[PDB]
Amino acid sequence: SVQPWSTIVQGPAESYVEFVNRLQISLADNPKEPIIDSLSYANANKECQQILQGRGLVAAPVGQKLQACAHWA
């Protein structure tokens, strides 16, 4: 019905790094870059999506997204 990584959603209290890590595990187990770069925005929680929208990093590589959300607690 759904691809396995599609259900990897950042928890309300889960850090952005840990969410990205979970997503990287799901993908490694089941081209990774275009999928991590899209889902690391779409599957992120309201709070972290709001950071990426405001800084204009929606389309940025995951590394830059990680750097931007590193201080979200």
UniProtKB/TrEMBL annotation:
Residues of the full protein shown: 238 to 315 of 1417
Subcellular location as annotated: Virion
Transmembrane segments: none
Record text on subunit structure and interactions: Homodimer; further assembles as homohexamers.
Function as written in the Swiss-Prot or TrEMBL entry: Forms the spherical core of the virus that encapsulates the genomic RNA-nucleocapsid complex.
Protein name in UniProt: Gag-Pro-Pol polyprotein
